[PDB]
Design a protein around this ligand. Structure first.
Ligand SMILES: Nc1ncnc2c1ncn2[C@@H]1O[C@H](C[C@@H](N)CC[C@H](N)C(=O)O)[C@@H](O)[C@H]1O
Ligand SMILES: Nc1ncnc2c1ncn2[C@@H]1O[C@H](C[C@@H](N)CC[C@H](N)C(=O)O)[C@@H](O)[C@H]1O
Lengths: 9, 344, 344, 10
């Protein structure tokens, strides 16, 4: 249930 | 009953607000410095759009944008949040001594009652490819609370589209599909499912970044003006395009990104997710063609991107493209709800 | 309306079966060679439990286990599958020319009708930490179709639990949570939610593998005998433990893995997910203690792991432990449905 | 919404 992707480093 | 529940499957909604109920997910958005710092800049640098004004924050999450509005002198901020994050926001409003100015209101902006009309609505309703989540529709719905000549932050959104070449991406997806080509997987013939497999893998939009040298033409722009659009405008989104190919090669699909503009009384501030700009948690989005199109520099690649809203808080995307010089066409369906998050 | 629908929220069901409807997700399981290869060996090497027998495949997915039953000579196999993967299985049955021996029945095993009783039930219904998904209950439910003295493959399942020390993993939780311990995150004091963030991170079981040197005591084992167990036996799972500590250190929590055995007429074959055995797609699972416990070698770490089934197809986990020589005590609550997938 | 983790890679 992937809504927003992980923020980049 | 409500406008929200009529357009949304319950299973979708539960899972959606569950995701945003996690402090870890709010932190993820907050820690995107380009996003969070650009929203702060847009609000503080347009302080007269906030000073002594009444504000609605649609989907306040942690409360972060309401705190910026308060930092800019807003008289009163209604912070609406449908997830259980609303309770955490209340805690922060109290610990920051802003109970006189930020009023958290738990529930869906389609279902709650505000005590008065507002001068300006702020939100961060952009999903990947702009339109995922269908939160833009909740943002537009909230205009029922907006005074005449009130403002919206953000004010407009541009979606950009450009053809790309990326053989490595194509083969990566194609290879996974060809698991289902095997005629003797542990002695079992899978090959009759080859076609369904390719179809499922290519329905997945690819979320990641890339070098701009992969783009084969100048990008086409489609604009949504939030000050003017109606929620119903977003049910069927049709983006025709005509690309003037600058490079010869195989077109493996279309790349999408979006910018939003905060058009204030003092200045306009842009938040960009473009591949030429500093990377955000939205990355960029690519829709691959199952069947790449060969084109020569100076050819035209024309067609239509059509986004049909579904009840799962997203869009069924169809992309038909064709090289005018040869009549070579590619037809594609993509399920925006089910992305492949490829970034490392 | 059914045994399944009564214990399961629709929102959870819908998402669960959507997941299994993806050929990519079936593919992920199939590609676990340890899993798929061991199922094949257990079935083939016990060919006499299958030759000319009637078989039920509970949750057949792509159909792979049902094909292995055919490879071993079964006369008739009923392959029950609740997700839309059912159609894809039906296609493979036809393309492998097994229409007369494998009959795919779409729907939940709690809701469909079989035309006759079967000699043997085959299934792969193990979630991470064994119990996740609550499909073990569907497998047990299916015994209503089993002939007296019919067999089950797998026949038994064993959970293992053991105390571990892993200072770096423990510390990684406070690192994550201390995002909230900032007095001026863009001008906002987030500190009041830090405690809540810690609790959120510690409620997630951790899915990944580890070096066996982290284990501080020999494991205790809890066993489910699928031939004898009733569905009700899985609603409340109480696992007492008394660990005799082999190494001195800070106990940071309990590690879990599981084995299943296929007890056939010719031989018993084991499928193990233990950290001593080659890695599977189940990895292992670790549940951290928010307050860790000091124990010296020779001490006893006593307590209870209590798993309570919930309507989201998973378990609320309660772990309570003490070091008997000192009385220091740790209580922990986890949400098995929301794990942290830490593996790369 | 991850029911099963990803199979470990060769
Ligand atoms: N219909 C709705 N009514 C109220 N809140 C919503 C609705 N749809 C989405 N949201 C919330 O809107 C938030 C969307 C976030 N992208 C924004 C969070 C926050 N404003 C921030 O900028 O960090 C999430 O917390 C959702 O729970
Ligand atoms: N109550 C149920 N009735 C029918 N199928 C179910 C039920 N619960 C889970 N399943 C299915 O069981 C399968 C579980 C998989 N772990 C096994 C897939 C396949 N048998 C394999 O070994 O590759 C999924 O395809 C689920 O959709």
């Amino acid at each position: 249930g992937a809504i927003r992707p992980a923020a980049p480093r | 009953r409500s406008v929200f529940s009529e357009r949304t499957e319950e299973s979708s909604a539960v899972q959606y607000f569950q995701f945003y109920g996690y402090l870890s997910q709010q932190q993820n958005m907050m820690q995107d410095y380009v996003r969070t710092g650009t929203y702060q800049r847009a609000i503080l640098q347009n302080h007269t759009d906030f000073k002594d004004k009444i504000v609605l924050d649609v989907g306040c999450g942690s409360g972060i944008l309401s705190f910026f509005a308060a930092q800019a002198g807003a008289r009163k901020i209604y912070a609406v949040e449908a997830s259980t994050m609303a309770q955490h926001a209340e805690v922060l409003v109290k610990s920051n001594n802003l109970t006189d100015r930020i009023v958290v209101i738990p529930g869906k902006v389609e279902e709650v009652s505000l005590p008065e009309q507002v001068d300006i609505i702020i939100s961060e309703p952009m999903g990947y490819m702009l339109f995922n989540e269908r939160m833009l529709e909740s943002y537009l719905h909230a205009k029922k609370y907006l005074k005449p000549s009130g403002n919206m932050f953000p004010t407009i959104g541009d979606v950009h589209l450009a053809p790309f070449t990326d053989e490595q991406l194509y083969m990566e997806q194609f290879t996974k599909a060809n698991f289902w080509y095997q005629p003797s997987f542990h002695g079992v013939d899978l090959s009759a499912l080859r076609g369904a497999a390719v179809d499922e893998y290519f329905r997945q939009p690819v979320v990641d970044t890339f070098d701009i040298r992969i783009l084969m033409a100048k990008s086409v722009k489609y604009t949504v003006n939030f000050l003017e659009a109606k929620e119903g405008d977003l049910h069927r989104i049709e983006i025709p395009f005509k690309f003037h190919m600058l490079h010869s090669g195989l077109v493996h699909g279309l790349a999408f990104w979006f910018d939003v503009a905060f058009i204030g009384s003092i200045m306009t501030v842009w938040l960009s997710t473009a591949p030429t700009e500093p990377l955000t948690h939205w990355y960029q989005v690519r829709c691959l063609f199952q069947s790449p199109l060969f084109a020569k520099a100076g050819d035209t690649l024309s067609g239509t991107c059509l986004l049909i809203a579904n009840k799962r808080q997203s869009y069924d995307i169809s992309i038909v493209a064709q090289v005018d010089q040869t009549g070579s066409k590619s037809s594609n369906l993509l399920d925006l709800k089910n992305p492949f998050f490829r970034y490392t």
